[PDB]
Amino acid sequence: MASMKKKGSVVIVGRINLSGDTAYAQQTRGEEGCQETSQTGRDKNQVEGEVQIVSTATQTFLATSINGVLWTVYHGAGTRTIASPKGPVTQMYTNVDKDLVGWQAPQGSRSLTPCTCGSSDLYLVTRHADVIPVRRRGDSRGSLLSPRPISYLKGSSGGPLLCPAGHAVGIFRAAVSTRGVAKAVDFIPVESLETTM
Ligand SMILES: COc1ccc2nc(C)c(O[C@@H]3C[C@H]4C(=O)N[C@]5(C(=O)NS(=O)(=O)C6(C)CC6)C[C@H]5/C=C\CCCCC[C@H](NC(=O)OCC5(C)CC5)C(=O)N4C3)nc2c1
Ligand SMILES: [Zn+2]
Numbered sequence: 001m002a003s004m005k006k007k008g009s010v011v012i013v014g015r016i017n018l019s020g021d022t023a024y025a026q027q028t029r030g031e032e033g034c035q036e037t038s039q040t041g042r043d044k045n046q047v048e049g050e051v052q053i054v055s056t057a058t059q060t061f062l063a064t065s066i067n068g069v070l071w072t073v074y075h076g077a078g079t080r081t082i083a084s085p086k087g088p089v090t091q092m093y094t095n096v097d098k099d100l101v102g103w104q105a106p107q108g109s110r111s112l113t114p115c116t117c118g119s120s121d122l123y124l125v126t127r128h129a130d131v132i133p134v135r136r137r138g139d140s141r142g143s144l145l146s147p148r149p150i151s152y153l154k155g156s157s158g159g160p161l162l163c164p165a166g167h168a169v170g171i172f173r174a175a176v177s178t179r180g181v182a183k184a185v186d187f188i189p190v191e192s193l194e195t196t197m
Contacts, residue, residue, distance in 0.1 A: 008038030008041075008057055009088045010054050010076075010083065012047060012083070016053070016127070017049060018125070019049070025128060029043075037083045040083070042084075043084055048110070050064060050065050050110050051160060054076070061073065062158035063077075064112065064158060065105040065111040066111055066114060067114060070082070070106060071102045071188075073158050073173060074098075074099045077101050079101075082103045084106060095196060099174075113168065115167035117163045119136075120136035121133070121136075125161075128156075132145075132146075133145040139189055140173075140186055141186055144183060144184065147183045150180055151180075152182070161185070171193070
């Protein structure tokens with residue numbers, strides 16, 4: 001069929017700045033430039049940092065570099081390429097059973113180190129640069145110390161859960177809610193990433 005369309009690439013549209021004493025979101029590309037970059041797959045913007053804000057034509061979420069792989073959720077990215085300076089980059093990891101995908105980390109990004117602390121005092125980083133204390137409750141669950149409406153977590157899948165030392169403990173996947181209040185989060189453990197690799 002000569003009519004059949006191709007889905008666009010995932011596009012980096014900003015980042016969560018964790019460099020200093022204050023966490024804050026930065027936008028690096030507007031909606032229109034995102035639209036064109038998604039269709040061409042050609043993204044000339046400089047990439048920095050560990051947590052990227054990413055978008056498709058219809059969804060926005062996060063992606064996190066750990067050990068030289070930019071990781072995110074399958075329910076956001078599907079099987080899509082990511083835009084890069086030389087054109088679309090095909091996924092190097094895809095696992096729908098884990099809700100997980102990964103591409104080679106962009107040039108200029110910084111990678112988080114996988115946590116080996118065994119600590120259960122975690123920190124979730126959201127797309128609004130909120131740093132949310134989370135107590136680990138199992139291999140893939142943690143409770144929010146201060147619950148809040150799921151609205152505040154929407155769009156943060158693909159972001160990191162970090163240990164007190166700033167290592168990557170997991171990738172935020174799903175919210176566990178009661179009457180619209182997020183009491184707990186479900187995440188992909190970093191060990192599951194390390195095994196996928
Ligand atoms: C298609 O192929 C696949 C393969 C595997 C897969 N595996 C999943 C677990 C999954 O789940 C769905 C997406 C996910 C998010 O919503 N993810 C974010 C998020 O932010 N997404 S997002 O906005 O960035 C978006 C949509 C990308 C743009 C983090 C939340 C934030 C708010 C959630 C509010 C309402 C939703 C509450 C819900 N809860 C829950 O399902 O609990 C289950 C469990 C743990 C047993 C009890 C929930 O979280 N999700 C539902 N889809 C798939 C799909
Ligand atoms: Zn650690």
